[PDB]
Amino acid sequence: PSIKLQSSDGEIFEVDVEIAKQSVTIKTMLEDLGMDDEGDDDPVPLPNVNAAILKKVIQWCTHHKDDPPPNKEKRTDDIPVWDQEFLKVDQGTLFELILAANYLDIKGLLDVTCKTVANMIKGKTPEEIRKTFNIKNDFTEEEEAQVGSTQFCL
Amino acid sequence: KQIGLDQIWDDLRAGIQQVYTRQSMAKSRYMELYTHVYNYCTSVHQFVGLELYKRLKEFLKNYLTNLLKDGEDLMDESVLKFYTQQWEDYRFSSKVLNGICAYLNRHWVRRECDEGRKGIYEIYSLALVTWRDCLFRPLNKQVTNAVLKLIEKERNGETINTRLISGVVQSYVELGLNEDDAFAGPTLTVYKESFESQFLADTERFYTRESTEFLQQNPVTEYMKKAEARLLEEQRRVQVYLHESTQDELARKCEQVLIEKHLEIFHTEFQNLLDADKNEDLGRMYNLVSRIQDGLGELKKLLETHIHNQGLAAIEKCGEAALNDPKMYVQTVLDVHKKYNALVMSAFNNDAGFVAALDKACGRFINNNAVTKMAQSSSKSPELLARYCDSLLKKSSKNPEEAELEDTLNQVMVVFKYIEDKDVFQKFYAKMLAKRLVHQNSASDDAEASMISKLKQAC
Amino acid sequence: DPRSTFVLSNLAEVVERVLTFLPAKALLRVACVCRLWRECVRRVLRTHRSVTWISAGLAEAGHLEGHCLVRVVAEELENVRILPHTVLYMADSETFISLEETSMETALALEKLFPKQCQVLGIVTPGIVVTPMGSGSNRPQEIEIGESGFALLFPQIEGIKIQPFHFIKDPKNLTLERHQLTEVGLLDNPELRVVLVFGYNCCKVGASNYLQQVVSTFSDMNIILAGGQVDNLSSLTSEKNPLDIDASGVVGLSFSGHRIQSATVLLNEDVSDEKTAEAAMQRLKAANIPEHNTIGFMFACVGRGFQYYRAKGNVEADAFRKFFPSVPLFGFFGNGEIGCDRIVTGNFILRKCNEVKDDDLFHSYTTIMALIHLGS
Amino acid sequence: SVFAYESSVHSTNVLLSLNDQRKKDVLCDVTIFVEGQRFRAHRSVLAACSSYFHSRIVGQADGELNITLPEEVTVKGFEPLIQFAYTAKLILSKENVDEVCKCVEFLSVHNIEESCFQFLK
Amino acid sequence: SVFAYESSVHSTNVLLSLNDQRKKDVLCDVTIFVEGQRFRAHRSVLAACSSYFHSRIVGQADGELNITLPEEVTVKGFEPLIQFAYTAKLILSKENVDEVCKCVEFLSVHNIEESCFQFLKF
């Protein structure tokens, strides 16, 4: 099993087929189309991810390759020991992993990264959250004023 | 932004029309046809409403209408090599279209539905909802009337070339209505109305055009052997014409068309097939009527009313010596209940109900039978039996075999059950038993002691 | 400066799989982050079709001033996941007395934490039988005298509408003209399938017969009755009456919907050991009531339990989970019984012909079960 | 000690299966000759949906039957009527209301209310 | 402008009219024997209510067919069943349960479930 992927900036990395089959997008193209005489070790140029991120995704896929996929439990904070060690990176790159996880459809990787964003979201007040994500500030104060006025409570 | 909305529908319709007409789509461009559709669905300038869904409905309805033009002027054996070849070039082809537009198959189609509207489907399930623009157009009248012409080659035609038909039947099953409801049992709803309803009406005729054409030129003994073949052949014309759910319903409407509506001359032939010692024809005959109910119990009285017309023939040929010759009246009836016992054993699969035929029907020629009538006594029949067992269970020249001492008594035990009046047996047995015990005119004392032990088992 | 000024504010599918991984209370906090987040909060708060329960066991008898149940409901509501809409809570009859009755202090305490829009019915019984937190496989614990209680959080479920009702007694007045059965929905409702009638302070004459009269008004339909007589009431959210502790009446929930299946088995004086009890609950299993999204109820008599079945306890509770593998259980011990043998589902109804008048409902010294399939 | 079993889906399923029988040859034992075209139905449902058919169906011996509606009814107003009789749904449009309403007030079909009154426009 | 009418009373009344037509023999076109106690019904009703009176009712002529049932079914289990086949209400009693349940599988009458019966106290 051997498949070579090409990043957006022109770098080439060789990965295992089964480890690539972890991503649904890669396996769907490789199972419903790849049943033929392949182009000779032709690279697959994913044009939305640069060289650096593809390592981070493939690094996550290397460790999380023996996980049986089961499934519907109360949302929690398990977050296995490896992920946050992997995920201690500056703010920007973590967001880029979100796109890479969403683009290739990796449920496990998308599951973990969104947890830390929620954890960073948790324990804050609505307004203060902007100073860490720089969101816009809008719509008729009034609506807000008669929108964000249907809750708290409990 | 960085996406746009109108630059995309100028290169997407260069591989979305190149994935169709399969021409070795390289993986190098597959992700290019994804990066477009993905970017198309992640921006605000706002998934450009729902236009991509609409534009993906027009191209499909153009490859399915410009294509109907070639094919809707074609007769049999050609529309059956057009809806089996360009079905694998649309099932396969529109399954790459289910993962090129993946981002429009996960979020918007599950959020544009489960909300405010209908007419939203997964793009794959959208392909086989617009495929009913080439099906509710020929086919439904032009292959269903053509597959039958091919399936009506049971007569002599070999090399049916199953592959073409297997494509058609599997197509109708696959075309099962996925419209609305959800993505949940089976989908055999577009199968009944197009290849089941109009396959059974056309399978009655082919069989009621050989049934009453074979029992007019050949004896019934060949319809009894063609039926087994055809009733079995129409159980192997499934499992290569398939999806099942027809085995338990094609077989029935191949069973009242062969033997449930010709159960008029079977009973008539049953009598003829009973005077003769024929024993393999009844087995096939029993097997045919075994499948059919309401009539297994009709050819049950005739056999019951044949041993009785056979029992009072052997004891009739016994003559006049039977009155003063004890063995004869026992051996004769025993022969009757040996041969017809095998009949209810080998031929009719030892049916419990059929044993009843070998039963009391045997009783009605042991109670009020001949010989007993001639020297008028219903009570006479036990006496001849009573003398017989004593006749052998006596001191004589020599008791030759220990085995014959059991089996004859065991054989005697069989005919005992049918006499319906024990009382006389106890009288006449005891009387001459007293003569036996007093004079010790018996050998192997255990054997008689075994007889009351058999009597202990009996009344 | 980082990327998610674009991503975390425009990409809808990424703001959706974030707000799911938050406690319910935080989900209504970030609802005022921006305009896109609001829509995401509403969508996430609509894929909530699971009932969640909170209970207070005997292993938390803290020697400090405060109700045990109020303490748990304070800590646990922080980590709750669904937004409660209607709540049914019961507690034992020693945790609502501080001087001789005091009752408001304990009652309004729980009436304050719950949301203002939420509907609260407050009922106190002499005995709580409850399944602990976690999953549906917890072994039920039957609690006689001793501080215990549970709270049931019903979320917003599509197509199912639940409305409390309350008929106060009178010194001298009419009975019930017609409208209170239409105001709440006990009559003229083509989809009423389960009712959970409760009664309190029935000791006085007339009041004992009040429960006799009030039930007959909305009976004789294709519905399931369940419940009995209890001690007193604590809190009801009607916003038009300061609750009177001395007055008696009839209160309960009135389930209504198109998929609410039900089941009921009486446990008469013919069951007195383990094998007989298991035989009765085998009949419930034959009703083919689905497993998921069902909650069970057990209303019994104070004369049943340790005393009645010889020297054993948690016997009904253990038999419930012997044949039903994962359904929860909640019920009280009381001085009265209501119920019959009846199954109502989407298709069939199995009423008892009960041709005398209505003598198939008011039993005594017995136990009633229920299998209310809230949802589908 | 007597129990009942009251179903709530048997009526609809038996009516739908009888309608399928209506649309498929067998077990149909009456033909409605109307305006030239043919309509085939049952001699049991039609004696239960209204009174015009009821007054003309009873008493007469079994066999082949024409119960021709002579001229007064239309076909556009007739097709929805037997559909309602056998399935209990109606199909009304702004170009259909008048003839259907004329047919109901003539045949006196029951279980249909005048609610087909202001739904239009 | 397809409003479409929907009546929740059009099926119950039709099935009650069928019962009334059955009782006073108003166009009954089928006679059935169980042991001997003559019953009368409609061919169309039983052609869809059960799934044995759909294989012993089709492929016949307009001449009245007199079908007979074996001794395995009796009259104690049919009268409850054929009354439910017309009124959608099946009365049960102590002696009824066994025979009325035994009748079902030989007929496979639809829209009745034979697992709920094993719930009654009786």
Short mmCIF file of C-alpha atoms in Angstrom, two decimals, chain B residues 43-432:
data_model
loop_
_atom_site.label_atom_id
_atom_site.label_comp_id
_atom_site.label_asym_id
_atom_site.label_seq_id
_atom_site.Cartn_x
_atom_site.Cartn_y
_atom_site.Cartn_z
CA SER B 43 -18.22 31.57 1.28
CA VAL B 44 -20.46 34.61 1.76
CA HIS B 45 -21.19 36.66 -1.37
CA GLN B 46 -23.52 32.59 0.74
CA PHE B 47 -23.54 29.14 -0.91
CA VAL B 48 -25.14 31.16 -3.75
CA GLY B 49 -28.56 30.02 -2.56
CA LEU B 50 -29.50 26.69 -4.13
CA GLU B 51 -28.52 27.30 -7.75
CA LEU B 52 -25.91 24.51 -7.95
CA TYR B 53 -28.65 21.99 -7.16
CA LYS B 54 -30.77 23.37 -10.00
CA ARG B 55 -27.86 23.49 -12.45
CA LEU B 56 -27.07 19.87 -11.55
CA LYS B 57 -30.66 18.92 -12.38
CA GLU B 58 -30.54 20.39 -15.90
CA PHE B 59 -27.36 18.61 -16.99
CA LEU B 60 -28.70 15.25 -15.80
CA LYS B 61 -31.99 15.90 -17.60
CA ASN B 62 -29.95 16.68 -20.72
CA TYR B 63 -27.86 13.53 -20.64
CA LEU B 64 -31.08 11.59 -20.07
CA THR B 65 -33.17 13.28 -22.80
CA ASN B 66 -30.60 13.75 -25.58
CA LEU B 67 -29.90 10.07 -24.93
CA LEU B 68 -33.51 8.86 -25.12
CA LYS B 69 -33.41 9.96 -28.78
CA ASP B 70 -31.16 6.97 -29.53
CA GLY B 71 -33.08 3.94 -28.29
CA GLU B 72 -36.76 4.83 -28.50
CA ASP B 73 -37.00 3.52 -32.06
CA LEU B 74 -35.59 0.09 -31.27
CA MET B 75 -37.33 -3.29 -31.13
CA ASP B 76 -36.56 -6.33 -28.90
CA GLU B 77 -33.03 -7.64 -28.24
CA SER B 78 -31.76 -4.10 -28.81
CA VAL B 79 -33.54 -2.16 -26.06
CA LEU B 80 -32.36 -5.06 -23.92
CA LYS B 81 -28.75 -4.28 -24.85
CA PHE B 82 -29.28 -0.56 -24.23
CA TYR B 83 -30.83 -0.59 -20.76
CA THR B 84 -28.20 -2.98 -19.42
CA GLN B 85 -25.12 -1.27 -20.84
CA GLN B 86 -26.10 2.38 -20.32
CA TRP B 87 -27.27 1.63 -16.79
CA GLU B 88 -23.83 0.56 -15.60
CA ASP B 89 -22.61 3.75 -17.30
CA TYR B 90 -25.00 5.79 -15.17
CA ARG B 91 -24.95 3.88 -11.86
CA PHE B 92 -21.15 3.87 -11.89
CA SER B 93 -20.88 7.30 -13.50
CA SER B 94 -23.30 8.97 -11.10
CA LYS B 95 -21.51 7.56 -8.06
CA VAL B 96 -18.40 9.68 -8.62
CA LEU B 97 -20.96 12.49 -8.65
CA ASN B 98 -21.62 11.46 -5.04
CA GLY B 99 -18.34 12.65 -3.58
CA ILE B 100 -17.30 15.27 -6.07
CA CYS B 101 -20.20 17.31 -4.72
CA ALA B 102 -19.65 15.90 -1.23
CA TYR B 103 -19.84 19.26 0.56
CA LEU B 104 -23.22 19.77 -1.12
CA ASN B 105 -24.25 16.27 0.00
CA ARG B 106 -23.46 16.62 3.74
CA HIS B 107 -24.43 20.08 4.98
CA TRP B 108 -26.77 21.67 2.42
CA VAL B 109 -29.19 18.77 1.58
CA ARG B 110 -29.32 17.90 5.27
CA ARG B 111 -29.89 21.53 6.29
CA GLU B 112 -31.87 22.61 3.22
CA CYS B 113 -33.98 19.60 4.12
CA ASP B 114 -35.09 18.78 7.67
CA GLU B 115 -36.49 22.33 7.79
CA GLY B 116 -38.80 24.16 5.37
CA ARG B 117 -39.05 22.32 1.99
CA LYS B 118 -39.17 19.17 -0.16
CA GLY B 119 -37.56 18.27 -3.48
CA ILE B 120 -34.16 17.98 -1.82
CA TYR B 121 -32.21 14.75 -2.23
CA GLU B 122 -28.68 13.44 -2.07
CA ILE B 123 -27.20 13.94 -5.53
CA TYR B 124 -26.87 10.17 -6.01
CA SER B 125 -30.49 9.67 -4.98
CA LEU B 126 -31.25 12.64 -7.23
CA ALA B 127 -29.76 10.75 -10.18
CA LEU B 128 -32.11 7.83 -9.62
CA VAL B 129 -35.12 10.12 -9.32
CA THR B 130 -34.39 11.79 -12.65
CA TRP B 131 -33.62 8.35 -14.08
CA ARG B 132 -37.41 8.08 -14.14
CA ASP B 133 -37.23 10.17 -17.29
CA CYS B 134 -35.90 7.23 -19.33
CA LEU B 135 -37.99 4.65 -17.43
CA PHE B 136 -41.44 6.25 -17.47
CA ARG B 137 -40.49 6.50 -21.18
CA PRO B 138 -39.95 3.29 -23.14
CA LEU B 139 -38.69 0.36 -21.04
CA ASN B 140 -41.75 0.11 -18.78
CA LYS B 141 -43.57 -1.04 -21.91
CA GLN B 142 -40.63 -1.87 -24.15
CA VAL B 143 -38.39 -4.14 -22.02
CA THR B 144 -41.10 -5.64 -19.80
CA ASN B 145 -42.70 -6.79 -23.05
CA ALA B 146 -39.19 -7.75 -24.27
CA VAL B 147 -37.73 -9.51 -21.21
CA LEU B 148 -40.82 -11.72 -21.24
CA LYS B 149 -40.07 -12.60 -24.86
CA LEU B 150 -36.60 -13.66 -23.74
CA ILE B 151 -37.82 -15.35 -20.54
CA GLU B 152 -40.36 -17.19 -22.70
CA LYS B 153 -37.52 -19.37 -24.03
CA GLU B 154 -38.11 -22.08 -21.45
CA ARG B 155 -39.39 -24.28 -24.29
CA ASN B 156 -36.19 -25.04 -26.22
CA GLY B 157 -34.16 -21.84 -26.32
CA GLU B 158 -30.83 -22.31 -24.57
CA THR B 159 -28.27 -19.55 -23.90
CA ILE B 160 -30.80 -17.13 -22.43
CA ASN B 161 -27.80 -14.85 -21.81
CA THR B 162 -28.97 -14.19 -18.23
CA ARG B 163 -26.61 -11.20 -17.85
CA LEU B 164 -28.86 -8.84 -19.81
CA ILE B 165 -31.95 -9.87 -17.85
CA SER B 166 -30.12 -9.73 -14.50
CA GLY B 167 -29.32 -6.11 -15.29
CA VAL B 168 -32.96 -5.28 -16.00
CA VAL B 169 -34.46 -6.90 -12.89
CA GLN B 170 -31.79 -5.43 -10.61
CA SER B 171 -32.44 -2.04 -12.22
CA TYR B 172 -36.14 -2.07 -11.30
CA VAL B 173 -35.32 -3.11 -7.73
CA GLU B 174 -32.68 -0.38 -7.51
CA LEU B 175 -35.16 2.19 -8.89
CA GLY B 176 -37.21 1.55 -5.75
CA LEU B 177 -38.92 4.76 -4.72
CA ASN B 178 -36.46 6.75 -2.64
CA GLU B 179 -38.57 9.87 -3.26
CA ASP B 180 -39.34 11.55 0.08
CA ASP B 181 -39.71 9.42 3.24
CA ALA B 182 -36.11 9.23 4.55
CA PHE B 183 -32.87 7.30 4.04
CA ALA B 184 -34.20 4.26 5.90
CA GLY B 185 -37.13 -1.91 4.74
CA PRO B 186 -36.69 -3.09 1.15
CA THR B 187 -37.34 -1.18 -2.07
CA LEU B 188 -39.45 -3.70 -4.04
CA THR B 189 -42.13 -1.17 -4.99
CA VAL B 190 -41.10 -0.47 -8.60
CA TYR B 191 -40.59 -4.22 -9.05
CA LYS B 192 -44.16 -5.48 -8.53
CA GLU B 193 -45.82 -3.09 -10.98
CA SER B 194 -43.37 -3.63 -13.83
CA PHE B 195 -41.70 -7.08 -13.69
CA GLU B 196 -43.76 -9.14 -11.26
CA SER B 197 -47.38 -8.34 -12.10
CA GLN B 198 -46.56 -8.47 -15.81
CA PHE B 199 -44.48 -11.63 -15.52
CA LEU B 200 -46.97 -13.86 -13.75
CA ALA B 201 -49.86 -13.23 -16.13
CA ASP B 202 -47.45 -14.13 -18.93
CA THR B 203 -46.28 -17.25 -17.10
CA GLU B 204 -49.80 -18.65 -16.68
CA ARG B 205 -50.35 -18.64 -20.44
CA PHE B 206 -47.11 -20.41 -21.37
CA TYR B 207 -48.07 -23.19 -18.95
CA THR B 208 -51.77 -23.37 -19.78
CA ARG B 209 -50.66 -23.74 -23.40
CA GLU B 210 -48.57 -26.82 -22.65
CA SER B 211 -50.59 -28.41 -19.82
CA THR B 212 -53.77 -28.91 -21.83
CA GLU B 213 -51.69 -29.75 -24.91
CA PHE B 214 -49.71 -32.56 -23.29
CA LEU B 215 -52.62 -34.32 -21.58
CA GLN B 216 -54.32 -34.60 -24.97
CA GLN B 217 -51.57 -36.45 -26.83
CA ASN B 218 -49.72 -38.25 -24.02
CA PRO B 219 -50.93 -40.30 -21.02
CA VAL B 220 -51.21 -38.80 -17.55
CA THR B 221 -47.99 -40.60 -16.65
CA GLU B 222 -45.94 -37.94 -18.44
CA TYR B 223 -47.73 -34.95 -16.99
CA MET B 224 -46.83 -36.55 -13.65
CA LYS B 225 -43.17 -36.28 -14.68
CA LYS B 226 -43.12 -32.99 -16.61
CA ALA B 227 -44.75 -31.26 -13.64
CA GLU B 228 -41.85 -32.17 -11.35
CA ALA B 229 -39.35 -30.79 -13.87
CA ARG B 230 -41.21 -27.54 -14.57
CA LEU B 231 -42.16 -26.97 -10.93
CA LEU B 232 -38.46 -27.43 -10.15
CA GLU B 233 -37.30 -25.49 -13.23
CA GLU B 234 -39.43 -22.58 -12.04
CA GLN B 235 -37.37 -22.61 -8.84
CA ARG B 236 -34.05 -22.29 -10.69
CA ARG B 237 -35.33 -19.52 -12.98
CA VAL B 238 -35.06 -17.64 -9.73
CA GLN B 239 -31.47 -17.12 -8.48
CA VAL B 240 -30.40 -15.52 -11.82
CA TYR B 241 -33.71 -13.63 -12.08
CA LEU B 242 -33.81 -12.31 -8.66
CA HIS B 243 -34.08 -10.08 -5.57
CA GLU B 244 -36.26 -12.96 -4.36
CA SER B 245 -39.61 -12.16 -2.72
CA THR B 246 -41.00 -14.20 -5.61
CA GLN B 247 -39.98 -17.79 -4.75
CA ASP B 248 -42.90 -18.20 -2.34
CA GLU B 249 -45.25 -16.44 -4.74
CA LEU B 250 -44.12 -17.60 -8.20
CA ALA B 251 -44.12 -21.22 -7.03
CA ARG B 252 -47.73 -21.01 -5.85
CA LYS B 253 -48.85 -19.49 -9.16
CA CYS B 254 -47.06 -22.28 -10.94
CA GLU B 255 -48.73 -24.91 -8.73
CA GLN B 256 -52.44 -24.18 -9.24
CA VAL B 257 -51.69 -23.78 -12.95
CA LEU B 258 -50.17 -27.25 -13.20
CA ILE B 259 -51.65 -29.51 -10.51
CA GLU B 260 -54.46 -27.89 -8.59
CA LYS B 261 -56.85 -27.27 -11.48
CA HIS B 262 -56.22 -30.59 -13.16
CA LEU B 263 -57.27 -32.52 -10.04
CA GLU B 264 -60.05 -34.15 -12.04
CA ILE B 265 -58.13 -36.76 -13.98
CA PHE B 266 -55.67 -37.62 -11.24
CA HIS B 267 -58.12 -39.51 -9.04
CA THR B 268 -59.37 -41.37 -12.11
CA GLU B 269 -55.77 -42.28 -12.94
CA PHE B 270 -55.12 -43.00 -9.25
CA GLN B 271 -57.45 -46.00 -9.45
CA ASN B 272 -55.71 -47.25 -12.59
CA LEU B 273 -52.34 -46.57 -10.95
CA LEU B 274 -53.48 -48.70 -8.00
CA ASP B 275 -54.66 -51.98 -9.56
CA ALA B 276 -51.23 -52.17 -11.16
CA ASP B 277 -48.30 -52.85 -8.84
CA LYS B 278 -46.79 -49.52 -9.93
CA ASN B 279 -44.93 -48.07 -6.95
CA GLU B 280 -42.71 -45.24 -8.28
CA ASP B 281 -45.47 -43.31 -10.06
CA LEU B 282 -47.43 -42.90 -6.82
CA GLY B 283 -44.37 -41.40 -5.11
CA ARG B 284 -44.05 -38.70 -7.76
CA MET B 285 -47.85 -38.43 -7.78
CA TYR B 286 -47.94 -38.11 -4.00
CA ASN B 287 -45.18 -35.50 -4.13
CA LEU B 288 -47.13 -33.35 -6.61
CA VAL B 289 -50.28 -33.42 -4.48
CA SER B 290 -48.18 -33.08 -1.32
CA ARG B 291 -47.50 -29.46 -2.28
CA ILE B 292 -51.20 -28.82 -2.89
CA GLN B 293 -53.63 -28.79 0.01
CA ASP B 294 -57.36 -29.55 -0.16
CA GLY B 295 -57.08 -32.80 -2.10
CA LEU B 296 -54.43 -34.72 -0.22
CA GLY B 297 -57.45 -35.99 1.71
CA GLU B 298 -59.42 -36.92 -1.41
CA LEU B 299 -56.96 -39.52 -2.72
CA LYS B 300 -57.12 -41.09 0.75
CA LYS B 301 -60.57 -42.68 0.57
CA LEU B 302 -59.90 -44.35 -2.78
CA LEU B 303 -56.92 -46.22 -1.34
CA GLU B 304 -59.03 -46.92 1.76
CA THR B 305 -61.71 -48.21 -0.63
CA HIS B 306 -59.27 -50.35 -2.62
CA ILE B 307 -57.79 -52.70 -0.01
CA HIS B 308 -61.37 -53.47 1.04
CA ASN B 309 -62.15 -54.42 -2.56
CA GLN B 310 -58.84 -56.29 -2.46
CA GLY B 311 -59.22 -57.90 0.98
CA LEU B 312 -62.47 -59.63 0.07
CA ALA B 313 -60.79 -61.15 -2.98
CA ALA B 314 -57.93 -63.04 -1.35
CA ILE B 315 -60.09 -64.57 1.39
CA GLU B 316 -62.55 -65.23 -1.42
CA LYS B 317 -59.86 -67.15 -3.31
CA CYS B 318 -59.16 -68.97 -0.02
CA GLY B 319 -62.06 -71.21 -1.00
CA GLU B 320 -64.05 -73.41 1.36
CA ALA B 321 -61.23 -75.07 3.32
CA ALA B 322 -60.72 -71.80 5.21
CA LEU B 323 -63.42 -72.84 7.69
CA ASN B 324 -61.49 -75.96 8.73
CA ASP B 325 -57.95 -74.76 8.02
CA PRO B 326 -56.84 -72.20 10.62
CA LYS B 327 -53.54 -71.01 9.10
CA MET B 328 -55.17 -69.98 5.81
CA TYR B 329 -57.51 -67.38 7.31
CA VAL B 330 -54.55 -65.77 9.08
CA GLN B 331 -51.85 -65.99 6.41
CA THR B 332 -54.20 -64.64 3.73
CA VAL B 333 -55.16 -61.45 5.58
CA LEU B 334 -51.54 -61.02 6.70
CA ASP B 335 -50.42 -60.96 3.06
CA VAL B 336 -52.92 -58.15 2.41
CA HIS B 337 -51.42 -56.22 5.32
CA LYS B 338 -47.86 -56.71 4.11
CA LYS B 339 -47.86 -55.39 0.54
CA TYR B 340 -50.14 -52.40 1.12
CA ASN B 341 -48.21 -51.65 4.30
CA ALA B 342 -45.12 -50.96 2.19
CA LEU B 343 -47.30 -48.74 -0.02
CA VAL B 344 -48.20 -46.56 2.96
CA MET B 345 -44.56 -46.81 4.03
CA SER B 346 -42.42 -46.33 0.92
CA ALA B 347 -44.68 -44.52 -1.54
CA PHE B 348 -46.64 -42.07 0.62
CA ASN B 349 -43.77 -41.14 2.99
CA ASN B 350 -45.36 -42.93 5.98
CA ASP B 351 -48.01 -40.22 6.29
CA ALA B 352 -49.81 -40.43 9.63
CA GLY B 353 -53.16 -39.83 7.95
CA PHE B 354 -52.43 -42.39 5.25
CA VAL B 355 -51.73 -45.02 7.93
CA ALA B 356 -55.41 -44.60 8.82
CA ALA B 357 -56.13 -45.96 5.34
CA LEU B 358 -54.07 -49.07 6.08
CA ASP B 359 -55.99 -48.92 9.39
CA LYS B 360 -59.75 -49.41 9.95
CA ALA B 361 -60.30 -50.02 6.23
CA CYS B 362 -58.39 -53.18 7.18
CA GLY B 363 -60.81 -53.50 10.10
CA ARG B 364 -63.82 -53.54 7.79
CA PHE B 365 -62.64 -56.71 6.06
CA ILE B 366 -61.76 -58.55 9.29
CA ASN B 367 -64.99 -58.01 11.25
CA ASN B 368 -67.84 -58.49 8.76
CA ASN B 369 -65.79 -60.12 5.99
CA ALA B 370 -66.46 -63.31 4.03
CA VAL B 371 -66.06 -66.82 5.51
CA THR B 372 -67.42 -65.26 8.71
CA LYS B 373 -70.59 -64.37 6.80
CA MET B 374 -70.81 -67.82 5.17
CA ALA B 375 -70.80 -69.52 8.57
CA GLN B 376 -72.62 -66.57 10.02
CA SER B 377 -70.71 -65.24 13.04
CA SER B 378 -68.94 -61.91 13.46
CA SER B 379 -67.40 -63.66 16.48
CA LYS B 380 -65.97 -66.36 14.19
CA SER B 381 -63.02 -64.25 13.01
CA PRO B 382 -61.27 -64.22 16.44
CA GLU B 383 -61.75 -67.99 16.71
CA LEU B 384 -59.76 -68.78 13.57
CA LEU B 385 -57.05 -66.44 14.84
CA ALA B 386 -57.40 -68.01 18.29
CA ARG B 387 -56.84 -71.49 16.87
CA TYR B 388 -53.90 -70.29 14.75
CA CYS B 389 -51.69 -69.00 17.57
CA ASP B 390 -52.46 -72.10 19.63
CA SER B 391 -51.85 -74.24 16.53
CA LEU B 392 -48.22 -73.10 16.38
CA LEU B 393 -47.80 -72.65 20.15
CA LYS B 394 -48.30 -76.35 20.88
CA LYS B 395 -46.14 -79.39 21.50
CA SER B 396 -45.60 -80.77 17.99
CA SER B 397 -42.98 -82.61 15.92
CA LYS B 398 -40.40 -79.98 16.87
CA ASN B 399 -40.28 -76.24 17.50
CA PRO B 400 -37.83 -75.57 14.66
CA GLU B 401 -36.63 -72.01 15.31
CA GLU B 402 -36.68 -69.81 18.40
CA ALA B 403 -36.93 -66.77 16.12
CA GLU B 404 -40.03 -68.02 14.28
CA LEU B 405 -41.59 -68.46 17.72
CA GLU B 406 -41.37 -64.69 18.30
CA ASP B 407 -42.03 -63.26 14.84
CA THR B 408 -45.17 -65.28 14.07
CA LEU B 409 -46.61 -64.23 17.43
CA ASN B 410 -45.39 -60.69 16.71
CA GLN B 411 -47.10 -60.94 13.32
CA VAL B 412 -50.18 -62.26 15.13
CA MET B 413 -50.09 -59.20 17.38
CA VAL B 414 -50.54 -56.94 14.34
CA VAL B 415 -53.90 -58.31 13.17
CA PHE B 416 -55.11 -58.45 16.78
CA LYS B 417 -55.73 -54.70 16.99
CA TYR B 418 -58.33 -54.72 14.19
CA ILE B 419 -60.74 -57.43 15.39
CA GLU B 420 -62.80 -54.90 17.39
CA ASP B 421 -64.11 -57.70 19.65
CA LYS B 422 -61.56 -59.20 22.03
CA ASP B 423 -64.02 -61.16 24.20
CA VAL B 424 -64.22 -64.24 21.95
CA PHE B 425 -60.42 -64.47 21.80
CA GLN B 426 -60.16 -64.69 25.60
CA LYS B 427 -62.79 -67.45 25.64
CA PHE B 428 -61.44 -69.71 22.90
CA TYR B 429 -57.80 -69.11 23.84
CA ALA B 430 -58.40 -69.99 27.49
CA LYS B 431 -60.44 -73.12 26.74
CA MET B 432 -57.76 -74.88 24.71
#
